[PDB]
Symmetry: C5
Subunit: 204 residues, 5 copies
């Protein structure tokens, strides 16, 4: 695993091939989680930010930007969306969390909580996933779609198997996240497939 | 007598079912009142904020958001509307007061007074009401309407039987409201029906 | 007379009836005046702010709002209009002076001078007026029109029989005006007709 | 030879008659010049700011406002235009210099240089002009067009027979211009024709 | 061999004729480079900023403005585009760098990094070029197109054969660039063709 501190992955072009696989030893179904990352894209169409599919299950966990000012979260093929005021183009810091017990999804955009939404109360996002950055999956590992691909830069990705309270979200936003135990930018196991480059993070 | 301070009700989805009943043994008609609460919603359509119906009387006392920037208050099926410059989406603090002798209705949005309007001078809003949050009543406890439903977060809801002066409006807005006698967020009696969750107030 | 310091007239609804008659023993024709007052309305339509008619003369002195950012002044049925940048809805402090010898009308809106316009050079606005607030006269004391009626709040109304220099405009603006001889909010003689209420001025 | 220090001219209404003739014993052709003045108008339509015609030559030197954010300069009937961000309505300080040898025209708006443009390299602006304020000339001293009329206030008009450095533009803008030798607000020879008043300058 | 510190090239008119040839004795092909300059123009149409052509190859290296907020880079006839929030009209400081090994193109507008794009990885941009300012070349030295001409001012043009780190971009934006070895505004070799004047830089 690699230390990607002060670095980002830049997907420099639109394609249906370019993507990087994120590898975690996830054995037990997710009950809770929080996923934070930074992104910088000047795409005005919709795209996938983070895809997570399991054997025979599409959009098990998907974080999707519909358009400017609105973000969607998919849990077990059901989705929820929340709006926010934001500049275009501009770098963005995103956290989203979800708990199975209340069904509540929480988005934070640049430190700022959006309205809470709920979906899939009492569900478990299954284990042994295929997580990819740069493309939206429609099979376990594949069936990409050029019109949902992400082109730009992603950095500082962390994923925890708990719902973080606001002070921890805020730490991540401001550059000091707690060590994450599902995905950690500072000890990341990834595969680059296609044309993606690691360049220093110069937009924060 | 449940102390909900630091907490909100979240209506996580749209429906004609989810709602909470606020219970108060109000037996004597209202001549004067002030009602304050916070809300957080990214609905663009019209929605009911606070629905107070009595036996055989619709919209006995209703706070309604028409659209961004525009609030309505119904007293005894009569309605007055006032505008304010507003950001969307954004959390809001709302007080409204009414007094029978003058008929004057006073809106205070995030500490700013809207233009006074007047209605129902000399009228007394009936007692023994059925107060619902999340849905808009068209009967005495029911006849809900999906497109007037409220999905978002409501907290810090206080109802007094007098018209509060500006400094007490400001105190409520600031987070130190005077104890209330009709409805008090710190000693509230309610019933949750459907899918509504109590979460901490993270957006203030 | 009555001291209205710290109070405002609330015209709480649209009507063809509610209005207030300002009384001044004005016996000499006016060659110079300035008129200052504060107003708070969320009306989008055109409205009359201050209507001054004499025997056989309509619109002898009319201060009229065409639309947001557009104020008009009528002198002996003649009219000029001047534009300002302004927010809607917002409280506004207005002064306007008019000089017979030059014909020049000055508007000051929240302390800012508008572009000077000119009308009726050498005219004298006739005495013994009927002055009304809340409605636009078409006769000597009446002939109101619902669609030019004022809904909202007026206060801190003063009228001088001279043209005030800028510094006396700013004083009025910041809350310490020169005692007026034609109309003074702190020594006012008025009749309320219809639904109009007096309330503390909570928005300045 | 009137000191108009602290005064402006105010064209209080739209007409085809009102104007001021500016008088100068300009008996040799211009190779370079700088023209500065302040203006306050709420006209949305196009309008002449400064009209300089010679015998048999229309639009010899004309400073024309096309619309908000767009100023034009005519030199010997050739036109050039530069844009700027500006508020409306609002007072503006304007300065335009032209240089025969290069053809370079520079606009400064409220101290801000616009993009330089070029016209009529090698040309000399003919002497013995008629210069009018308030109308646009199509003939030597006349043929005005009401839809090009200036309604508003002008003052602090100075004209030099050299191109001023930015230092001296900044100084003019700040209220201390260099003594001018074609046209000088503090030693101005003019004829008022029609309805134009002189009033103190209250908006800078 | 001229030192243009505090000076600028102004293209005052639209045409298909006026341009400046920059001469650089570039013998090797380029793998890395950085090109910075300031430009001030109020064209709303597309225009070429910097045109670099070689024997038989169109758009070997072209910086092109598509419309307000949109900048294009051509390397060997492939093209990438990146967007920024931008005021119009207003001066701008542009840097762009490109790296063969990764294909990564970096735009920096007013010291702010745009989203990275990638093109032509493994490619070497050809030497012995013909570089022109004001026009967009379509042959080696010529075939100019009036609707891509640049009319405005360009100054402080530096070209390095390395990829500058953000520190050196900023110091170049802030008025103290590193000495440049492919093009250097302080030791520039150029030819003027047509109407293009040299004047002091006043908009910085
Ligand atoms: Ca999918
Ligand atoms: Ca798909
Ligand atoms: Ca109802
Ligand atoms: Ca209903
Ligand atoms: Ca009338
Ligand atoms: Ca009328
Ligand atoms: Ca003409
Ligand atoms: Ca004309
Ligand atoms: Ca080309
Ligand atoms: Ca071309």
């Amino acid at each position: 695993h690699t230390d990607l501190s002060g670095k980002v992955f830049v997907f420099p072009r639109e394609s249906v091939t370019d993507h990087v696989n994120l590898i975690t030893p996830l054995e037990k179904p997710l009950q809770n989680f929080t996923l934070c990352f930074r992104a910088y894209s000047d795409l005005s169409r919709a795209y996938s930010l983070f895809s997570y599919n399991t054997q025979g299950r599409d959009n098990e966990l998907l974080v999707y930007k519909e358009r400017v000012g609105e973000y969607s979260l998919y849990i077990g093929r059901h989705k929820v969306t929340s709006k926010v005021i934001e500049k275009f183009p501009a770098p963005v810091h995103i956290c989203v969390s979800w708990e199975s017990s209340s069904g509540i999804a929480e988005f934070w955009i640049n430190g700022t909580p959006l309205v809470k939404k709920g979906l899939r109360q009492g569900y478990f996002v299954e284990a042994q996933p295929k997580i990819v950055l740069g493309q939206e999956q429609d099979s376990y590992g594949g069936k990409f779609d050029r019109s949902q691909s992400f082109v730009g830069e992603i950095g500082d990705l962390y994923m925890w198997d708990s719902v973080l309270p606001p002070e921890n979200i805020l730490s991540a936003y401001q550059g000091t996240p707690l060590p994450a135990n599902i995905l950690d930018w500072q000890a990341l196991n990834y595969e680059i497939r296609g044309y993606v480059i690691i360049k220093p993070l110069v937009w924060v």
